[PDB]
C-alpha cells in the first residue's frame, strides 16, 4: 500500500500563503519563507494586543493632561485624578479623554464643580 502524498501538502501551504498575501517582496510568494514569516506576524499580533491596552491608556492620559492644564495656571493631571477620587467619581480615562475631545464644555463643567 504505497501512499503518495500529493493533495495534503499545498492544500495547507495555500492557507499558509493566504495570510501572507499582503506582504512585500519575497515574503509573499516563497513557500518556506512564507512559513517562516507567518509565524512572526502572528507573534507580533499577539504581542501588540497587550501593548495596545497600555498604550491607548497612555494616550488618553496625555489627552486629559493637555485638556486640564488649560484651566488654572497651577492645575495638573496628577492632582485632577486624586480630586476625582476625593469626591468618589468612577469615570475611567477613556470617557474622560474622549469627552475632552468631543465636548470640552463637559470637561469645563466637571472641572467647575469638582473644586468647590
Amino acid at each position: 500500500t504505497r501512499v503518495k502524498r500529493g493533495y495534503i501538502a499545498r492544500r495547507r501551504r495555500k492557507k499558509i500563503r493566504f495570510f501572507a498575501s499582503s506582504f512585500r517582496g519575497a515574503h509573499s510568494r516563497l513557500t518556506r519563507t512564507i512559513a517562516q514569516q507567518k509565524i512572526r506576524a502572528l507573534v507580533s499580533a499577539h504581542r501588540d494586543r497587550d501593548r495596545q491596552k497600555r498604550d491607548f491608556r497612555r494616550l488618553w492620559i496625555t489627552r486629559i493632561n493637555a485638556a486640564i492644564r488649560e484651566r488654572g495656571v497651577y492645575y495638573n493631571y496628577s492632582k485632577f485624578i486624586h480630586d476625582l477620587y476625593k469626591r468618589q467619581l468612577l469615570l475611567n480615562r477613556k470617557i474622560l479623554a474622549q469627552i475632552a475631545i468631543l465636548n470640552p464644555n463637559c470637561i469645563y463643567m466637571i472641572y467647575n464643580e469638582i473644586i468647590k
Binding site: 507573534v43 469615570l91 463637559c106 467647575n112
Partner: protein, 134 residues
C-alpha cells in the same frame, strides 16, 4: 417636467436620518465604560442569563448630558436607569493566540472567539437631580 423626472429617478438625495432625542449618557456594563445615546446599538460582553429579544435596564449610569448637562457627585446620578433591549448573543471574530519561543520547537497555535452581546438602546429616563452647566 421630464427633465426633473429621469435624473431624480436615477441619482437621489438624503433626509436627516431620524428624529433623535439627543440626550447622551455614560453606562458601565462589564467593568467597561460606554457613552450611550438612544436609538442606537452597542457591543458588550455576553450577558449571562439574557434571552435573544428581552428588554433590560442598566443601573450604572455615571453621567448624563443635554443642553444643560448633569455630572454625578457620587457614582450613579440617583434614580436614573437607562432603558435597552438585547438583540443577539453571537460570538466575536476569531483572535489567533500564538505562543512562540525561539528555537525550542515550541509553536503553539490556538484560536479564541470571545462571546459577546448586541444591545439596542431605546431611551434615557430623565435625571431630576444636581443640575450643573453654567
Amino acid at each position: 417636467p421630464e427633465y426633473n423626472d429621469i435624473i431624480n429617478q436615477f441619482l437621489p438625495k438624503k433626509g436627516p436620518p431620524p428624529p433623535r432625542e439627543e440626550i447622551f449618557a455614560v453606562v458601565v456594563i462589564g467593568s467597561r465604560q460606554y457613552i450611550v445615546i438612544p436609538g442606537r446599538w452597542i457591543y458588550t460582553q455576553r450577558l449571562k442569563g439574557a434571552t435573544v429579544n428581552d428588554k433590560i435596564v442598566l443601573n450604572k449610569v455615571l453621567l448624563v448630558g443635554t443642553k444643560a448637562s448633569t455630572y454625578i457627585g457620587t457614582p450613579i446620578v440617583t434614580n436614573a436607569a437607562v432603558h435597552a433591549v438585547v438583540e443577539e448573543q453571537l460570538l466575536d471574530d476569531k483572535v489567533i493566540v500564538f505562543k512562540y519561543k525561539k528555537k525550542k520547537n515550541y509553536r503553539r497555535n490556538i484560536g479564541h472567539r470571545q462571546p459577546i452581546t448586541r444591545i439596542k438602546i431605546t431611551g434615557i429616563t430623565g435625571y431630576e437631580d444636581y443640575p450643573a452647566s453654567t
